[PDB]
Amino acid sequence: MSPSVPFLKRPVALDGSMVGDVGFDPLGLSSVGDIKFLREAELKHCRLAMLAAAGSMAQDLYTFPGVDKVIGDAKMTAVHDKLVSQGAMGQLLVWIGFAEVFATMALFETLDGKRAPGDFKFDPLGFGKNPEALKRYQLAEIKNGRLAMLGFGGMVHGYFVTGKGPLELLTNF
Amino acid sequence: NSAAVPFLSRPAALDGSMVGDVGFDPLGFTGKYDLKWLREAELKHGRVAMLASLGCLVQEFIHLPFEATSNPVASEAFFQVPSGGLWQIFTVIGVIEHVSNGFNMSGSTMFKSGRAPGNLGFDPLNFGKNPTARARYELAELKNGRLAMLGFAGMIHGCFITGKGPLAALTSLDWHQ
């Protein structure tokens, strides 16, 4: 079965219920552990990686006033290394750690069945109300996050090979 | 279920009775400790911090005539000031604590009398006559005390860093470094 991998049996844990479930688990990593935990991890990685990809492109295009003096010609991980000394990365770490302690509480609730994986009730503009909308926007979120994980991996490793940011690379090659 | 952390369940102890409750206890301190003790601690911290923040702000601009009391920086003032006066304040604060609590200054014994948390009977001018005004004042006191806790924390740490008074530090922000 397994629509994704047609020559493998459908993963036992994956019943097709969750959004973006094409029965893709060739190595059987869903059998080990709880699928709710893996979905929370996947959505965390999706959101973080797509923020990261958009941030890489946006840093390549624009930089805030006065950052050029601090970072020089640094791009990507070089910017990281440069601003760890300055203290920016430390402040980001402090605040993200606060949010992540509260996300720890959220994950403990999820494992107990109270919370749906990846649901933090963050909908200020109120986009997802039409249950239909949320159902589409969930699929779009998962797909875009996966594409973004791959895209950020590609961006970082292209920087490793060449030393050029994503769009600066794309312009000249 | 919480109203503050919408993605977390409402703390069982917090049920909307005490003023200032928005269901904010993500770490479950209320289940482990007495809520009345926690509220007494909260209001005491807020009151001390309110007084402290106003103290720093007034100190940096208004000074006593003596040279030992002419430091705009609060942190530096603590050490420039005579130690005897600081210890006198310590002892007087201790006496006030003892008397106000009634010598029942423990977790087990403080609320044996049954007094409501945060109520030490200090209302000289009698501003709590009107019950509705009293409820508004209670919420305002809680909010302002929390704000003062955070604000004085910021003041003291910015005094450590900048080495200047609160508003001097605010107006002397180094935009070019």
Binding site: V12, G28, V32, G33 | -
Partner: protein, 92 residues
């Protein structure tokens, strides 16, 4: 007989066995993993751990963190193949 009941952690099951193989509750989080999955994991872990150990046998003063991490797969491969045998004789 008057001893207080012994407290045990949550979700504590009975793992005692007199069968040919334990009950696969012994493998915990990996109880639902396939025997073929355990076999492939054990072989891969053995190869990678042996390689990363050989890359560190003449230990230098600056060993590679990834090689140190991967060297822990040789001990891991043993448990993996024990789990493979357990899971082959329990129906999977």
């Amino acid at each position: 007989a008057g001893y207080s009941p012994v407290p045990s952690p949550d979700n504590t099951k009975e793992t005692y066995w007199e069968t040919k193989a334990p009950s696969s509750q012994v493998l915990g989080i990996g109880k639902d993993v396939s025997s073929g999955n355990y076999i492939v994991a054990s072989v891969v872990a053995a190869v990678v751990g042996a390689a990363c150990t050989g890359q560190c046998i003449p230990l230098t003063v600056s060993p590679n963190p990834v090689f140190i991490l991967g060297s822990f797969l040789l001990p891991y491969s043993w448990a993996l193949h024990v789990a493979a045998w357990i899971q082959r004789n329990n129906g999977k």
